[PDB]
Structure formats: C-alpha cells, structure tokens
Amino acid sequence: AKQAGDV
Amino acid sequence: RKTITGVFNSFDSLTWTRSVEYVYKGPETPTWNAVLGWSLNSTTADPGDTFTLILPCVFKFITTQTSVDLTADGVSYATCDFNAGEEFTTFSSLSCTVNSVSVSYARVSGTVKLPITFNVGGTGSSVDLADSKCFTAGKNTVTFMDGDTKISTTVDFDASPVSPSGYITSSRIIPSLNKLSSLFVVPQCENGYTSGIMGFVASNGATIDCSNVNIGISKGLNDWNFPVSSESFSYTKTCTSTSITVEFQNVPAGYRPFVDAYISAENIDKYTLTYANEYTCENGNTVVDPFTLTWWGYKNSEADSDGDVIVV
C-alpha cells in the first residue's frame, strides 16, 4: 500500500 | 615495501545529492560526496608503497567500483580499493598502493570525490548500536584518518522528520552480501507494553535470512529513530524463509521493541514486506494495524579524481 526507499 | 601516511591531506567538502526516492535527507541517505585533497611526492613515495584512509562511521561506498585511482590528466598515480564497513566494522576504509608510472614525476597533488553514506544505526547488531551514537542532528565535525593525521570538515545532518510515536521501518542494502537489512520498531507505548507481535512477511521475490536476525528492546531511539541499545525480554521467535514473527510479553516504560532481519531479494532494488504490527500497551486495548511497504533501490555513483603533476 505504500512505496519506500532503501538506504 | 613501506607504509606512507598523510597522503590524504585535506577534507575539502561534504555535499549531499539525492540518489534514492522517498527517504528524507539525512546521514544514511544516498548519496554524500566527500571531496578530499591528496598529494604524492616521488622523493618520499615509491611504486608499491601502501597507504590507508580510515572513514569512521561510514557504512559503505555508493558505487559498484572495486577501486578508484588517484589520477591527474589521465595518468594513474595510485589505486585505492574500497573496503566498506557494512555490518562488519563501524568504519570503512580505502587501502591504497602507489602505482608505477611510465615517466618520472617530482610530485602530484589533486582531489578525489568519494560517494558514501554514514552509519547512524539501523539494526540491533553490535556495529549499528555503536554507530547509533556517531552523530547527532545539527552541526557535526566529520573526521577521516590517514595514519595518525586527521582531516575534517563540518556538516549539517538533518534529523528524521518521521514521528518517533509510530512504527519505524528502514531497509538498507549491504552491497558485498547482495542482501538488505530490514528493521521494524513497534509504535510507542509510553508507560510500557503488555504484549505484542512484531515482524514481516516477504512477498515472492524476496526471502528472509533467519541466520541474521536481531530482536531486542531499546532504551529510546536516536535522532533517526534507530535503536541505541538491545536488551533482553520475554519473547518467542518464529522465522521461516517467508516470514519472521516475534510474540512478546511485558516491556518497561521507556523501551521500544524491535526486530530486524537480512533479506535476500532476486531483484535487490524491489521487494515487498507486509508487517504484522500488533501491540498492547499497559492500560490500553490491543491495536492490530498491519501495513505493506514496497522498498526501492538507490542509484550508484562513481568516484573520480583530478590533479596537477609537477615534473622534475
């Protein structure tokens, strides 16, 4: 349901 | 034959440029570029001599290069291999060797630009808990070491804007392992917890590595909402290659339960997790609040260098 970014 | 020191002689600038979507600007966020001054004098350095630069609190280099050369006008004076700290050590390093050259030179000086990210926590591992105290939000001095010499500059590190009251997640690529670490911190219960269930289930395309898991309670979180300690508490772990679930009992006020695991993904730049997220605060009712996140990789950059040679 949501997009997120890697570090 | 010998080790020379003081080749890296200045820390010129430290500048952030976005290389990943979604993530706030902060020390871990790809990519920080450190520009350093370097000099070699043939009176004091021979081909084959080695030198090393230590980068405290640096997790990794944001490049697929195995090495970078110290170059001036397309001549390579030295080769430096990248040695990322990752989850092995709290610092990264460059191990460098002076190169043989096809014509003689008196001395050469230039600059080198290194794409890095800093470690300010992210799992319950010894390395991350140590590095969770590396920097604070605001103004910090960043210092690298070449032998006994120290090169430093100033930087402004922004805190995470995410409220520490809710759940916290973080996914970090560990390049040398082709794996990620993935963290979940339970939402805050101010006066402690009666019980809860924390964890995540990986969608097709990714699997959980049950041999690299950390479960703990931390005494608060740092400026980036990461654990700063990992104490024991009563729980049961259920870990499969598809899911990790941790059911726990009481946790005291001021502590935050969390779980982290390594993830192997077929495509390291895309995987999805569905988080369980159940908790019962002391003097509260049980909350059940699952959610899903799809995690996207960052873009890598290249290190490069420039300089000026004096011939004689």
PDB file of C-alpha atoms in Angstrom:
ATOM      1  CA  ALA A   1       0.000   0.000   0.000  1.00  0.00           C
ATOM      2  CA  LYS A   2       2.938   2.469   0.210  1.00  0.00           C
ATOM      3  CA  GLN A   3       6.295   2.980  -1.502  1.00  0.00           C
ATOM      4  CA  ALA A   4       9.559   3.467   0.403  1.00  0.00           C
ATOM      5  CA  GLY A   5      13.302   3.819  -0.445  1.00  0.00           C
ATOM      6  CA  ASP A   6      16.357   1.916   0.569  1.00  0.00           C
ATOM      7  CA  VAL A   7      19.448   3.378   2.094  1.00  0.00           C
TER       8      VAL A   7
ATOM      9  CA  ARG B   1      57.819  -2.014   0.566  1.00  0.00           C
ATOM     10  CA  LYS B   2      56.794   0.720   3.057  1.00  0.00           C
ATOM     11  CA  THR B   3      53.663   2.409   4.503  1.00  0.00           C
ATOM     12  CA  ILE B   4      53.391   6.109   3.953  1.00  0.00           C
ATOM     13  CA  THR B   5      50.969   8.388   5.753  1.00  0.00           C
ATOM     14  CA  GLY B   6      49.498  11.779   5.209  1.00  0.00           C
ATOM     15  CA  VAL B   7      48.717  11.277   1.501  1.00  0.00           C
ATOM     16  CA  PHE B   8      45.147  12.451   2.173  1.00  0.00           C
ATOM     17  CA  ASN B   9      45.817  15.920   3.441  1.00  0.00           C
ATOM     18  CA  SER B  10      42.553  17.851   3.440  1.00  0.00           C
ATOM     19  CA  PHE B  11      38.797  17.334   3.678  1.00  0.00           C
ATOM     20  CA  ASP B  12      37.512  19.917   1.204  1.00  0.00           C
ATOM     21  CA  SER B  13      33.728  19.460   1.151  1.00  0.00           C
ATOM     22  CA  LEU B  14      30.869  17.084   2.072  1.00  0.00           C
ATOM     23  CA  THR B  15      27.733  17.548  -0.013  1.00  0.00           C
ATOM     24  CA  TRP B  16      24.540  15.532  -0.279  1.00  0.00           C
ATOM     25  CA  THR B  17      22.745  14.830  -3.567  1.00  0.00           C
ATOM     26  CA  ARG B  18      19.624  12.716  -3.701  1.00  0.00           C
ATOM     27  CA  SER B  19      20.112   9.247  -5.160  1.00  0.00           C
ATOM     28  CA  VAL B  20      17.019   7.489  -3.809  1.00  0.00           C
ATOM     29  CA  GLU B  21      13.284   8.372  -3.855  1.00  0.00           C
ATOM     30  CA  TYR B  22      11.113   8.758  -0.686  1.00  0.00           C
ATOM     31  CA  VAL B  23      13.737   8.824   2.001  1.00  0.00           C
ATOM     32  CA  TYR B  24      14.266  12.023   3.987  1.00  0.00           C
ATOM     33  CA  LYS B  25      17.695  13.762   3.729  1.00  0.00           C
ATOM     34  CA  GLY B  26      19.953  12.508   6.480  1.00  0.00           C
ATOM     35  CA  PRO B  27      23.364  10.845   7.088  1.00  0.00           C
ATOM     36  CA  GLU B  28      22.308   7.413   5.751  1.00  0.00           C
ATOM     37  CA  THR B  29      20.558   8.705   2.695  1.00  0.00           C
ATOM     38  CA  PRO B  30      22.317   8.100  -0.652  1.00  0.00           C
ATOM     39  CA  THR B  31      24.492   9.964  -1.540  1.00  0.00           C
ATOM     40  CA  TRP B  32      27.061  12.056   0.312  1.00  0.00           C
ATOM     41  CA  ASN B  33      30.129  13.064  -1.695  1.00  0.00           C
ATOM     42  CA  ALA B  34      33.326  13.695   0.271  1.00  0.00           C
ATOM     43  CA  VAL B  35      35.978  15.606  -1.658  1.00  0.00           C
ATOM     44  CA  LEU B  36      39.470  15.079  -0.241  1.00  0.00           C
ATOM     45  CA  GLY B  37      42.880  16.568  -1.160  1.00  0.00           C
ATOM     46  CA  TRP B  38      45.680  14.094  -1.893  1.00  0.00           C
ATOM     47  CA  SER B  39      49.426  14.507  -2.710  1.00  0.00           C
ATOM     48  CA  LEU B  40      52.254  12.154  -3.621  1.00  0.00           C
ATOM     49  CA  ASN B  41      55.963  13.227  -3.735  1.00  0.00           C
ATOM     50  CA  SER B  42      58.375  10.852  -5.510  1.00  0.00           C
ATOM     51  CA  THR B  43      61.078  11.889  -3.039  1.00  0.00           C
ATOM     52  CA  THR B  44      59.027  10.244  -0.247  1.00  0.00           C
ATOM     53  CA  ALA B  45      56.853   7.628  -2.027  1.00  0.00           C
ATOM     54  CA  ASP B  46      57.896   4.725  -4.332  1.00  0.00           C
ATOM     55  CA  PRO B  47      55.767   2.482  -6.557  1.00  0.00           C
ATOM     56  CA  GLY B  48      54.416  -0.338  -4.388  1.00  0.00           C
ATOM     57  CA  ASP B  49      54.310   1.751  -1.204  1.00  0.00           C
ATOM     58  CA  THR B  50      50.882   1.456   0.553  1.00  0.00           C
ATOM     59  CA  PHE B  51      48.708   3.963   2.486  1.00  0.00           C
ATOM     60  CA  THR B  52      45.258   3.719   4.047  1.00  0.00           C
ATOM     61  CA  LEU B  53      42.448   6.091   4.774  1.00  0.00           C
ATOM     62  CA  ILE B  54      40.041   5.329   7.608  1.00  0.00           C
ATOM     63  CA  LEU B  55      36.469   6.640   7.418  1.00  0.00           C
ATOM     64  CA  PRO B  56      34.847   6.411  10.895  1.00  0.00           C
ATOM     65  CA  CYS B  57      31.062   5.947  10.975  1.00  0.00           C
ATOM     66  CA  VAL B  58      30.869   5.342   7.214  1.00  0.00           C
ATOM     67  CA  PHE B  59      28.701   2.317   6.264  1.00  0.00           C
ATOM     68  CA  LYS B  60      29.564   1.922   2.603  1.00  0.00           C
ATOM     69  CA  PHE B  61      30.570   3.494  -0.718  1.00  0.00           C
ATOM     70  CA  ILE B  62      27.694   4.233  -3.078  1.00  0.00           C
ATOM     71  CA  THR B  63      29.482   2.764  -6.103  1.00  0.00           C
ATOM     72  CA  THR B  64      29.879  -0.632  -7.766  1.00  0.00           C
ATOM     73  CA  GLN B  65      33.575   0.135  -8.399  1.00  0.00           C
ATOM     74  CA  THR B  66      36.043  -2.106  -6.665  1.00  0.00           C
ATOM     75  CA  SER B  67      38.662   0.682  -6.629  1.00  0.00           C
ATOM     76  CA  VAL B  68      39.330   4.286  -7.549  1.00  0.00           C
ATOM     77  CA  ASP B  69      42.564   5.696  -8.959  1.00  0.00           C
ATOM     78  CA  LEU B  70      44.203   8.878  -7.849  1.00  0.00           C
ATOM     79  CA  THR B  71      44.686  10.469 -11.264  1.00  0.00           C
ATOM     80  CA  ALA B  72      45.941  13.724 -12.834  1.00  0.00           C
ATOM     81  CA  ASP B  73      45.405  14.447 -16.579  1.00  0.00           C
ATOM     82  CA  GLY B  74      44.634  10.763 -17.240  1.00  0.00           C
ATOM     83  CA  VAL B  75      47.722   9.416 -15.514  1.00  0.00           C
ATOM     84  CA  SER B  76      47.097   6.996 -12.561  1.00  0.00           C
ATOM     85  CA  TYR B  77      49.405   7.634  -9.628  1.00  0.00           C
ATOM     86  CA  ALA B  78      47.802   5.306  -7.121  1.00  0.00           C
ATOM     87  CA  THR B  79      44.966   2.746  -6.821  1.00  0.00           C
ATOM     88  CA  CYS B  80      42.696   2.671  -3.772  1.00  0.00           C
ATOM     89  CA  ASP B  81      40.478  -0.336  -3.021  1.00  0.00           C
ATOM     90  CA  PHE B  82      37.069   0.225  -1.354  1.00  0.00           C
ATOM     91  CA  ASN B  83      36.565  -1.598   1.983  1.00  0.00           C
ATOM     92  CA  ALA B  84      33.042  -0.906   3.250  1.00  0.00           C
ATOM     93  CA  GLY B  85      32.317  -1.243   6.981  1.00  0.00           C
ATOM     94  CA  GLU B  86      28.774  -2.530   6.436  1.00  0.00           C
ATOM     95  CA  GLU B  87      27.863  -4.830   9.390  1.00  0.00           C
ATOM     96  CA  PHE B  88      31.450  -5.983   9.862  1.00  0.00           C
ATOM     97  CA  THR B  89      33.073  -2.806  11.221  1.00  0.00           C
ATOM     98  CA  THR B  90      31.904   0.601  12.417  1.00  0.00           C
ATOM     99  CA  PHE B  91      34.209   2.348   9.840  1.00  0.00           C
ATOM    100  CA  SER B  92      35.019   1.994   6.169  1.00  0.00           C
ATOM    101  CA  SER B  93      38.479   2.351   4.600  1.00  0.00           C
ATOM    102  CA  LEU B  94      40.474   2.771   1.409  1.00  0.00           C
ATOM    103  CA  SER B  95      43.564   0.535   1.003  1.00  0.00           C
ATOM    104  CA  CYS B  96      45.792   2.243  -1.493  1.00  0.00           C
ATOM    105  CA  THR B  97      49.052   1.437  -3.368  1.00  0.00           C
ATOM    106  CA  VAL B  98      51.326   3.850  -5.221  1.00  0.00           C
ATOM    107  CA  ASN B  99      51.430   2.942  -8.917  1.00  0.00           C
ATOM    108  CA  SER B 100      54.349   2.523 -11.261  1.00  0.00           C
ATOM    109  CA  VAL B 101      54.239   5.214 -13.943  1.00  0.00           C
ATOM    110  CA  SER B 102      55.650   5.249 -17.475  1.00  0.00           C
ATOM    111  CA  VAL B 103      57.582   8.525 -16.981  1.00  0.00           C
ATOM    112  CA  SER B 104      59.110  10.101 -13.870  1.00  0.00           C
ATOM    113  CA  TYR B 105      57.454  12.877 -11.833  1.00  0.00           C
ATOM    114  CA  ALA B 106      58.588  15.119  -8.992  1.00  0.00           C
ATOM    115  CA  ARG B 107      55.233  15.453  -7.121  1.00  0.00           C
ATOM    116  CA  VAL B 108      51.488  15.420  -7.842  1.00  0.00           C
ATOM    117  CA  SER B 109      48.513  16.838  -5.953  1.00  0.00           C
ATOM    118  CA  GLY B 110      44.789  16.773  -6.570  1.00  0.00           C
ATOM    119  CA  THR B 111      41.386  15.894  -5.190  1.00  0.00           C
ATOM    120  CA  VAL B 112      39.229  12.731  -5.045  1.00  0.00           C
ATOM    121  CA  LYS B 113      35.473  12.532  -4.749  1.00  0.00           C
ATOM    122  CA  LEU B 114      34.092   9.604  -2.764  1.00  0.00           C
ATOM    123  CA  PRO B 115      30.303   8.661  -2.703  1.00  0.00           C
ATOM    124  CA  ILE B 116      29.481   7.431   0.784  1.00  0.00           C
ATOM    125  CA  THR B 117      26.658   7.051   3.359  1.00  0.00           C
ATOM    126  CA  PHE B 118      27.158   7.281   7.097  1.00  0.00           C
ATOM    127  CA  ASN B 119      26.042   4.734   9.663  1.00  0.00           C
ATOM    128  CA  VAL B 120      23.820   6.089  12.422  1.00  0.00           C
ATOM    129  CA  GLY B 121      22.178   2.770  13.300  1.00  0.00           C
ATOM    130  CA  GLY B 122      19.590   0.529  11.668  1.00  0.00           C
ATOM    131  CA  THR B 123      19.714  -2.910  13.381  1.00  0.00           C
ATOM    132  CA  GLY B 124      20.429  -4.409  16.771  1.00  0.00           C
ATOM    133  CA  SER B 125      23.921  -5.566  15.679  1.00  0.00           C
ATOM    134  CA  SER B 126      26.969  -4.504  17.732  1.00  0.00           C
ATOM    135  CA  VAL B 127      28.164  -2.350  14.835  1.00  0.00           C
ATOM    136  CA  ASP B 128      24.889  -0.479  14.406  1.00  0.00           C
ATOM    137  CA  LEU B 129      24.314   0.066  18.119  1.00  0.00           C
ATOM    138  CA  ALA B 130      27.831   1.516  18.381  1.00  0.00           C
ATOM    139  CA  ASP B 131      27.289   3.741  15.337  1.00  0.00           C
ATOM    140  CA  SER B 132      23.899   4.889  16.588  1.00  0.00           C
ATOM    141  CA  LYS B 133      25.918   7.345  18.771  1.00  0.00           C
ATOM    142  CA  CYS B 134      28.227   8.515  15.913  1.00  0.00           C
ATOM    143  CA  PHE B 135      26.430  11.830  15.121  1.00  0.00           C
ATOM    144  CA  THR B 136      23.519  13.958  16.357  1.00  0.00           C
ATOM    145  CA  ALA B 137      21.158  16.106  14.459  1.00  0.00           C
ATOM    146  CA  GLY B 138      22.568  19.521  13.577  1.00  0.00           C
ATOM    147  CA  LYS B 139      26.138  20.574  13.152  1.00  0.00           C
ATOM    148  CA  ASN B 140      28.829  17.847  13.356  1.00  0.00           C
ATOM    149  CA  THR B 141      32.500  17.556  12.551  1.00  0.00           C
ATOM    150  CA  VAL B 142      33.286  14.613  10.201  1.00  0.00           C
ATOM    151  CA  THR B 143      36.877  13.392  10.576  1.00  0.00           C
ATOM    152  CA  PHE B 144      38.777  10.798   8.486  1.00  0.00           C
ATOM    153  CA  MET B 145      42.241   9.475   9.428  1.00  0.00           C
ATOM    154  CA  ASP B 146      45.399   8.745   7.363  1.00  0.00           C
ATOM    155  CA  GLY B 147      47.870   7.165   9.741  1.00  0.00           C
ATOM    156  CA  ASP B 148      47.999   9.459  12.762  1.00  0.00           C
ATOM    157  CA  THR B 149      46.830  12.505  10.820  1.00  0.00           C
ATOM    158  CA  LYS B 150      43.211  13.733  10.946  1.00  0.00           C
ATOM    159  CA  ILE B 151      41.351  15.554   8.149  1.00  0.00           C
ATOM    160  CA  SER B 152      37.977  17.102   8.978  1.00  0.00           C
ATOM    161  CA  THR B 153      35.122  19.259   7.782  1.00  0.00           C
ATOM    162  CA  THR B 154      31.743  20.455   9.110  1.00  0.00           C
ATOM    163  CA  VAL B 155      28.367  19.273   8.076  1.00  0.00           C
ATOM    164  CA  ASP B 156      24.636  19.780   8.939  1.00  0.00           C
ATOM    165  CA  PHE B 157      22.865  16.462   9.441  1.00  0.00           C
ATOM    166  CA  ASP B 158      19.079  16.658   9.474  1.00  0.00           C
ATOM    167  CA  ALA B 159      17.069  14.546  11.940  1.00  0.00           C
ATOM    168  CA  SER B 160      14.444  12.187  10.688  1.00  0.00           C
ATOM    169  CA  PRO B 161      11.057  14.092  10.274  1.00  0.00           C
ATOM    170  CA  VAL B 162       9.157  10.850  10.969  1.00  0.00           C
ATOM    171  CA  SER B 163       7.487  10.969  14.409  1.00  0.00           C
ATOM    172  CA  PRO B 164       9.088   8.556  16.838  1.00  0.00           C
ATOM    173  CA  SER B 165       5.482   7.784  18.224  1.00  0.00           C
ATOM    174  CA  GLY B 166       4.521   5.457  15.347  1.00  0.00           C
ATOM    175  CA  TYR B 167       6.143   2.417  13.914  1.00  0.00           C
ATOM    176  CA  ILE B 168       9.597   2.892  12.270  1.00  0.00           C
ATOM    177  CA  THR B 169      10.875   0.920   9.283  1.00  0.00           C
ATOM    178  CA  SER B 170      14.207   1.038   7.469  1.00  0.00           C
ATOM    179  CA  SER B 171      15.754  -1.020   4.658  1.00  0.00           C
ATOM    180  CA  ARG B 172      19.487  -0.860   3.940  1.00  0.00           C
ATOM    181  CA  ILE B 173      21.429  -2.537   1.118  1.00  0.00           C
ATOM    182  CA  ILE B 174      24.553  -4.402   2.258  1.00  0.00           C
ATOM    183  CA  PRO B 175      26.321  -4.454  -1.166  1.00  0.00           C
ATOM    184  CA  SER B 176      29.037  -7.065  -0.571  1.00  0.00           C
ATOM    185  CA  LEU B 177      26.424  -9.604   0.561  1.00  0.00           C
ATOM    186  CA  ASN B 178      23.742  -8.900  -2.061  1.00  0.00           C
ATOM    187  CA  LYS B 179      21.325  -8.654   0.856  1.00  0.00           C
ATOM    188  CA  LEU B 180      19.443  -5.929   2.762  1.00  0.00           C
ATOM    189  CA  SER B 181      18.793  -5.405   6.381  1.00  0.00           C
ATOM    190  CA  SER B 182      15.222  -4.617   7.199  1.00  0.00           C
ATOM    191  CA  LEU B 183      14.032  -3.108  10.542  1.00  0.00           C
ATOM    192  CA  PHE B 184      10.701  -2.770  12.243  1.00  0.00           C
ATOM    193  CA  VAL B 185      10.220  -0.856  15.508  1.00  0.00           C
ATOM    194  CA  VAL B 186       6.908  -1.184  17.302  1.00  0.00           C
ATOM    195  CA  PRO B 187       4.840   2.005  17.898  1.00  0.00           C
ATOM    196  CA  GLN B 188       5.375   3.736  21.220  1.00  0.00           C
ATOM    197  CA  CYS B 189       3.515   2.701  24.400  1.00  0.00           C
ATOM    198  CA  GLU B 190       4.672   5.429  26.864  1.00  0.00           C
ATOM    199  CA  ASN B 191       4.153   3.507  30.028  1.00  0.00           C
ATOM    200  CA  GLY B 192       5.191   0.166  28.558  1.00  0.00           C
ATOM    201  CA  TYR B 193       3.731  -2.828  26.849  1.00  0.00           C
ATOM    202  CA  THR B 194       1.729  -5.856  27.980  1.00  0.00           C
ATOM    203  CA  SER B 195       2.331  -7.869  24.848  1.00  0.00           C
ATOM    204  CA  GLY B 196       2.658  -7.602  21.050  1.00  0.00           C
ATOM    205  CA  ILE B 197       3.516  -9.289  17.786  1.00  0.00           C
ATOM    206  CA  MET B 198       6.110  -7.719  15.505  1.00  0.00           C
ATOM    207  CA  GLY B 199       7.609  -8.853  12.211  1.00  0.00           C
ATOM    208  CA  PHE B 200       7.075  -9.003   8.473  1.00  0.00           C
ATOM    209  CA  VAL B 201       6.221 -11.391   5.685  1.00  0.00           C
ATOM    210  CA  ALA B 202       8.127 -11.192   2.427  1.00  0.00           C
ATOM    211  CA  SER B 203       6.288 -11.294  -0.874  1.00  0.00           C
ATOM    212  CA  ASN B 204       7.527 -13.547  -3.760  1.00  0.00           C
ATOM    213  CA  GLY B 205      10.886 -12.273  -4.975  1.00  0.00           C
ATOM    214  CA  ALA B 206      12.432 -11.969  -1.515  1.00  0.00           C
ATOM    215  CA  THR B 207      13.229 -14.236   1.395  1.00  0.00           C
ATOM    216  CA  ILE B 208      14.201 -13.790   4.981  1.00  0.00           C
ATOM    217  CA  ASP B 209      17.602 -14.902   6.151  1.00  0.00           C
ATOM    218  CA  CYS B 210      16.874 -16.468   9.532  1.00  0.00           C
ATOM    219  CA  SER B 211      20.582 -16.762  10.339  1.00  0.00           C
ATOM    220  CA  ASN B 212      20.955 -12.900  10.638  1.00  0.00           C
ATOM    221  CA  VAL B 213      18.113 -11.636  12.923  1.00  0.00           C
ATOM    222  CA  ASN B 214      18.241  -9.288  15.873  1.00  0.00           C
ATOM    223  CA  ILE B 215      15.458  -8.945  18.465  1.00  0.00           C
ATOM    224  CA  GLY B 216      15.664  -6.544  21.373  1.00  0.00           C
ATOM    225  CA  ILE B 217      14.266  -3.683  23.388  1.00  0.00           C
ATOM    226  CA  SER B 218      15.997  -0.344  23.063  1.00  0.00           C
ATOM    227  CA  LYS B 219      16.164   2.405  25.680  1.00  0.00           C
ATOM    228  CA  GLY B 220      14.620   5.054  23.458  1.00  0.00           C
ATOM    229  CA  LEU B 221      15.690   5.791  19.844  1.00  0.00           C
ATOM    230  CA  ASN B 222      18.203   8.177  18.375  1.00  0.00           C
ATOM    231  CA  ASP B 223      17.710  11.246  16.097  1.00  0.00           C
ATOM    232  CA  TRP B 224      16.965   8.926  13.167  1.00  0.00           C
ATOM    233  CA  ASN B 225      14.545   6.680  15.173  1.00  0.00           C
ATOM    234  CA  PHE B 226      17.071   3.827  15.368  1.00  0.00           C
ATOM    235  CA  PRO B 227      17.767   1.556  18.340  1.00  0.00           C
ATOM    236  CA  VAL B 228      20.551   2.636  20.659  1.00  0.00           C
ATOM    237  CA  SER B 229      20.529  -0.476  22.844  1.00  0.00           C
ATOM    238  CA  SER B 230      19.320  -4.109  22.661  1.00  0.00           C
ATOM    239  CA  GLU B 231      18.288  -5.592  25.961  1.00  0.00           C
ATOM    240  CA  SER B 232      16.627  -8.960  26.546  1.00  0.00           C
ATOM    241  CA  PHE B 233      12.897  -9.535  27.255  1.00  0.00           C
ATOM    242  CA  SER B 234      10.420 -12.485  27.026  1.00  0.00           C
ATOM    243  CA  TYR B 235       9.517 -13.445  23.537  1.00  0.00           C
ATOM    244  CA  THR B 236       9.080 -16.313  21.085  1.00  0.00           C
ATOM    245  CA  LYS B 237      10.695 -16.036  17.553  1.00  0.00           C
ATOM    246  CA  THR B 238       9.147 -17.892  14.597  1.00  0.00           C
ATOM    247  CA  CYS B 239      11.401 -17.480  11.495  1.00  0.00           C
ATOM    248  CA  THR B 240      10.844 -19.004   8.116  1.00  0.00           C
ATOM    249  CA  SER B 241      12.235 -18.038   4.773  1.00  0.00           C
ATOM    250  CA  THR B 242       8.930 -16.235   4.036  1.00  0.00           C
ATOM    251  CA  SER B 243       8.125 -14.683   7.391  1.00  0.00           C
ATOM    252  CA  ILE B 244       9.597 -13.569  10.746  1.00  0.00           C
ATOM    253  CA  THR B 245       7.151 -13.192  13.691  1.00  0.00           C
ATOM    254  CA  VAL B 246       8.080 -12.264  17.283  1.00  0.00           C
ATOM    255  CA  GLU B 247       5.393 -12.504  20.032  1.00  0.00           C
ATOM    256  CA  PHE B 248       6.462 -10.765  23.190  1.00  0.00           C
ATOM    257  CA  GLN B 249       5.221 -10.137  26.773  1.00  0.00           C
ATOM    258  CA  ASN B 250       5.942  -7.184  29.058  1.00  0.00           C
ATOM    259  CA  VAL B 251       8.281  -4.399  28.073  1.00  0.00           C
ATOM    260  CA  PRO B 252       9.017  -1.499  30.562  1.00  0.00           C
ATOM    261  CA  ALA B 253       8.256   2.134  30.086  1.00  0.00           C
ATOM    262  CA  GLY B 254      10.920   3.897  28.052  1.00  0.00           C
ATOM    263  CA  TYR B 255      11.806   0.836  25.980  1.00  0.00           C
ATOM    264  CA  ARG B 256      10.943   0.114  22.373  1.00  0.00           C
ATOM    265  CA  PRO B 257      10.743  -3.498  20.993  1.00  0.00           C
ATOM    266  CA  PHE B 258      12.154  -4.057  17.554  1.00  0.00           C
ATOM    267  CA  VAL B 259      13.113  -6.757  15.049  1.00  0.00           C
ATOM    268  CA  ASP B 260      15.437  -6.795  12.176  1.00  0.00           C
ATOM    269  CA  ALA B 261      16.433  -9.413   9.621  1.00  0.00           C
ATOM    270  CA  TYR B 262      18.572  -9.800   6.476  1.00  0.00           C
ATOM    271  CA  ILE B 263      16.618 -10.099   3.264  1.00  0.00           C
ATOM    272  CA  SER B 264      17.736 -11.749   0.033  1.00  0.00           C
ATOM    273  CA  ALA B 265      15.885 -10.442  -2.969  1.00  0.00           C
ATOM    274  CA  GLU B 266      16.027 -11.687  -6.552  1.00  0.00           C
ATOM    275  CA  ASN B 267      15.900  -8.009  -7.569  1.00  0.00           C
ATOM    276  CA  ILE B 268      17.748  -6.104  -4.780  1.00  0.00           C
ATOM    277  CA  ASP B 269      16.134  -2.896  -5.978  1.00  0.00           C
ATOM    278  CA  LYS B 270      12.497  -4.061  -5.355  1.00  0.00           C
ATOM    279  CA  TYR B 271      10.882  -6.171  -2.649  1.00  0.00           C
ATOM    280  CA  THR B 272       7.715  -6.035  -0.598  1.00  0.00           C
ATOM    281  CA  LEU B 273       7.022  -6.609   3.063  1.00  0.00           C
ATOM    282  CA  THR B 274       3.740  -6.941   4.925  1.00  0.00           C
ATOM    283  CA  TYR B 275       4.171  -6.090   8.558  1.00  0.00           C
ATOM    284  CA  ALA B 276       2.153  -7.702  11.291  1.00  0.00           C
ATOM    285  CA  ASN B 277       2.081  -4.833  13.774  1.00  0.00           C
ATOM    286  CA  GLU B 278       0.147  -5.816  16.921  1.00  0.00           C
ATOM    287  CA  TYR B 279       0.713  -4.301  20.277  1.00  0.00           C
ATOM    288  CA  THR B 280      -0.976  -3.870  23.629  1.00  0.00           C
ATOM    289  CA  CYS B 281       0.016  -1.040  25.791  1.00  0.00           C
ATOM    290  CA  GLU B 282      -0.235  -1.246  29.582  1.00  0.00           C
ATOM    291  CA  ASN B 283      -3.678   0.234  30.482  1.00  0.00           C
ATOM    292  CA  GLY B 284      -4.702   0.006  26.816  1.00  0.00           C
ATOM    293  CA  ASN B 285      -6.535  -2.186  24.353  1.00  0.00           C
ATOM    294  CA  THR B 286      -4.849  -4.284  21.683  1.00  0.00           C
ATOM    295  CA  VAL B 287      -4.059  -2.500  18.453  1.00  0.00           C
ATOM    296  CA  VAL B 288      -3.849  -4.505  15.224  1.00  0.00           C
ATOM    297  CA  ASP B 289      -2.552  -2.345  12.404  1.00  0.00           C
ATOM    298  CA  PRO B 290      -0.846  -4.260   9.557  1.00  0.00           C
ATOM    299  CA  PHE B 291       0.572  -2.394   6.597  1.00  0.00           C
ATOM    300  CA  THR B 292       2.628  -3.114   3.434  1.00  0.00           C
ATOM    301  CA  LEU B 293       5.702  -1.394   2.000  1.00  0.00           C
ATOM    302  CA  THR B 294       7.480  -1.905  -1.329  1.00  0.00           C
ATOM    303  CA  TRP B 295      11.151  -0.939  -0.985  1.00  0.00           C
ATOM    304  CA  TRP B 296      13.045   0.650  -3.924  1.00  0.00           C
ATOM    305  CA  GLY B 297      16.762   0.666  -4.519  1.00  0.00           C
ATOM    306  CA  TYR B 298      19.007   3.733  -4.881  1.00  0.00           C
ATOM    307  CA  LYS B 299      21.238   4.739  -7.804  1.00  0.00           C
ATOM    308  CA  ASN B 300      25.004   4.264  -7.530  1.00  0.00           C
ATOM    309  CA  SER B 301      27.563   6.944  -8.464  1.00  0.00           C
ATOM    310  CA  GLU B 302      31.284   6.805  -9.406  1.00  0.00           C
ATOM    311  CA  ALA B 303      34.301   8.029  -7.539  1.00  0.00           C
ATOM    312  CA  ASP B 304      36.736  10.072  -9.543  1.00  0.00           C
ATOM    313  CA  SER B 305      39.780  12.276  -9.144  1.00  0.00           C
ATOM    314  CA  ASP B 306      41.768  15.099 -10.696  1.00  0.00           C
ATOM    315  CA  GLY B 307      45.130  16.808 -10.082  1.00  0.00           C
ATOM    316  CA  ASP B 308      48.269  18.502 -11.373  1.00  0.00           C
ATOM    317  CA  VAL B 309      51.693  16.947 -11.735  1.00  0.00           C
ATOM    318  CA  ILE B 310      54.997  18.799 -11.357  1.00  0.00           C
ATOM    319  CA  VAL B 311      57.722  17.125 -13.488  1.00  0.00           C
ATOM    320  CA  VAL B 312      61.395  17.127 -12.412  1.00  0.00           C
TER     321      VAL B 312
END
